[PDB]
Structure 1
Amino acid sequence: YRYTGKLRPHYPLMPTRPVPSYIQRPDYADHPLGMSESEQALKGTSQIKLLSSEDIEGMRLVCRLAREVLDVAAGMIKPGVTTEEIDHAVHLACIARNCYPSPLNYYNFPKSCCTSVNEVICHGIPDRRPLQEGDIVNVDITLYRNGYHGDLNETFFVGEVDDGARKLVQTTYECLMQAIDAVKPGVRYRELGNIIQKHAQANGFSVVRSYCGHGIHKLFHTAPNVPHYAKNKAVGVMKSGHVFTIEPMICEGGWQDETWPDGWTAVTRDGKRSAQFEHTLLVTDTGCEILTRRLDSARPHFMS
């Protein structure tokens, strides 16, 4: 394998961390290959679930808790801290909230959250590498509670960053928020990618094509599929009661990705930087409810 940039994996990984048996598990937690029986039963299906009142309540609670856990991660972003230490703190923060960390053993994923530094687009595996000043780093959190998953991500600055970092992170955030702004019943899911790409393209950046936003509730990933690039052919129309994510991955250079021999880590083919943001949204009559918003602060961590 020829690495696309300077980043390398830092092994060995610590033994996987157990989740105490009192915390409710998703079906895949104990499947040997980490397969989700309830997801695979609905594979290849465009049909979007419409959430009941108790579904909505369950989605509200878990996305609130997921935010709390991301805020925990954010507080630890500094030079010399390893992504593995972030993951350990994340893992304990999920347990304290009586939640299962959804990434853990998801299709055998080894860790409790995804940490994506610089050229890693998404799905970075927490490891022994100390964060370096100048780095940007995305932490993507999902929690599982009483049957429901809640999912969000933010990109952070590691100490002081160069001007290109500031710009890429800002634009990425702007892309997310412009797409959230257009969410309301009757809007086509395929339109969000037109908005995202138009904004990224205007700022000299490209949009990753191989990963998408997703529906989420009792399933971690399900219908709808939500591309972040223009002229995509996404199937579906937004409706009051739909719950899904927008999670645009935006690149300094070109849009193309490939995966490390670990089966998970997705990196730019040119080794330039990528940034990402994610909220889980609920479609309402006025627009959408941002289930994963910060409740006690106006902005994402990179601003404050």
Structure 2
Amino acid sequence: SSKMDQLRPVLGRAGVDALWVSAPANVRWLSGFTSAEDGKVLVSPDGATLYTDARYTVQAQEESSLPQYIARPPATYEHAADTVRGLRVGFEAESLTVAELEDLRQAWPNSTLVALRGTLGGLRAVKTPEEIGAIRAAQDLADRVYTEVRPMIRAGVRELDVAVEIETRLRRAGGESAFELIVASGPNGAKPHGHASKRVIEDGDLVTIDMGARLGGYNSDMTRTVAVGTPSAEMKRVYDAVLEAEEAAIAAIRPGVRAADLDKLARDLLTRHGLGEAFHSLGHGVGLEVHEGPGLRGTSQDVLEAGMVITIEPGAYLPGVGGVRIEDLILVTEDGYEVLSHSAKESV
């Protein structure tokens, strides 16, 4: 199935005739345009057009699989107006600002603007072989940088300096850090989104490193926890249980498995090991964004299929004491899975 043929049935079930595409990830997904913050796409009964300005004329001609209309707003959607006369036009209500919607409403007085909220969640969940290649390249960069920086994670080093070393190397390679880096040591490990602080790593700490590369527009995401010196018996028990949970959830990945059931497997296991209040979401899709569909929460209705790329990231957090998360990036295959993130997972 082409990407447009994935989208149009969704729009039909949403009760709209057209879609104004404003989320940069979906502009790029549909058209191939890589400066998508400055493009928009109109999907309509007449076909699909990329709108961008004359700074991008050559780039858009080289990249876009869609015909182009070159202008700045508001000429872009005034030119579009004829195409959407009398139509129900969906828009991405979680992306579009009210001011932008007002502009469209003024431009399209004979259309009905229809808010789509979660409607396109998971639109991009199944990746093509080309997209998987770009995700592999990003994760391979992240693994290389993690391997290079790992020896530097020792007593006396600040969390922040570890983060600087990772960022430095990702940038020099032509990528960048995919999200604000987490290097969470000692009691900072109890913070699931504890961005690298000035705390000095000390003997006896666990250190949680959550990192990804964005490279060529595609993202990776992994987490490792390592010991500096000898951790407490309690923190070793926590680490072992989190690793056990991660390995069990990964081992259930296959087409047709329910995301919510993966979450249940991990929470039952953590509960069995005394951490039934310590762990939230088990993971998320990764692609043009770090966090995208599917979602691995207990309430999720998502169902995995081959070609999706997700994370599995159980964690347990003891406030004031410590915490552990271990996370891998997984490709769903036709009869199981492939782990894309290859950095070592150590004993503690």
State the alpha-carbon separation in 1 of the partners of residues 244 and 279 from structure 2.
18
Instruction: Look up the match of 2:185.
Output: 117
Unaligned runs of 5+ in 2: 1-33, 38-91, 97-115
**Kept in 2: contact 1:67–1:292 (CA 8 A):** yes
Bigger proportion of residues as helix: 2
Flag as ranges the 4+ runs of structure 1 deviating above 6 A: none
Q: Aligned Cα RMSD in Å?
A: 2.6
Separation of aligned partners in 2, 1:280 and 1:221: 12
AA matched with 2:262: L
Match of 1:47 in 2: 122
Counterpart-to-counterpart distance in 2, 1:72 and 1:90: 9
Q: 1:209 to 1:302 in 2, by over 3 A?
A: closer
Task: Answer whether contact 1:73 1:139 (CA < 8 A) is retained.
Answer: no
**Does the CA contact (< 8 Å) of 1:74 and 1:301 recur in 2?**
no
For the pair 1:180 / 2:255, whether they are aligned, the reply is no
**Which is worse superposed, 58-67 or 143-152?**
58-67
Distance 2:166 2:322 in 1: 24
For residues 5-32 of structure 1, give each alpha carbon's deviation from its aligned partner in whole angstroms, at most 9, with x where no partner exists: xxxxxxxxxxxxxxxxxxx9996xxxxx
Question: What letter matches 2:222 in structure 1?
Answer: L
Which structure has the higher relative contact order (CA within 8 Å, separation 6+)?
A: 1
Segments of 5+ residues of structure 1 without an aligned counterpart are: 1-23, 28-36, 105-112, 253-267
Matched residue, 1:70: 146
State whether structure 2 residue 309 is matched by structure 1 residue 243.
yes
Write out aligned runs for 1:94-133 (5 A): 94-104=170-180, 113-119=181-187, 120-133=190-203
Q: Which position in structure 1 is the counterpart of 2:263?
A: 193
Letter in 1 for 2:346: H
Q: Tell me which structure has the larger Cα radius of gyration.
A: 2
What TM-score do you get using the length of structure 2 for normalisation?
0.63
Does the CA contact (< 8 Å) of 1:100 and 1:145 recur in 2? yes
Cα 1:43–1:156 change in 2 (3 A) is farther
What is the identity, as a one-letter code, of the residue corresponding to 1:241? Answer: G
- The alpha-carbon deviation at position 288 of structure 1 amounts to 0.8
Q: After the TM superposition, which residues 113-262 of structure 1 pair with which residues of structure 2 at under 5 Å, given as runs? A: 113-119=181-187, 120-206=190-276, 210-227=280-297, 232-252=298-318
Shift of 1:155: 0.9
Q: 1:43 to 1:193 in 2, by over 3 A?
A: same
Aligned-partner SS, 1:94: helix
- The DSSP-based 3-state class of the residue aligned with 1:206 is coil
SS of the residue corresponding to residue 79 of structure 1 reads: coil
Tell me which residue corresponds to 1:279.
328
Provide the aligned length of Structure 1 versus Structure 2.
Answer: 239
Percent of pairs with identical residues: 24
What does residue 293 of structure 1 align with?
Answer: 342
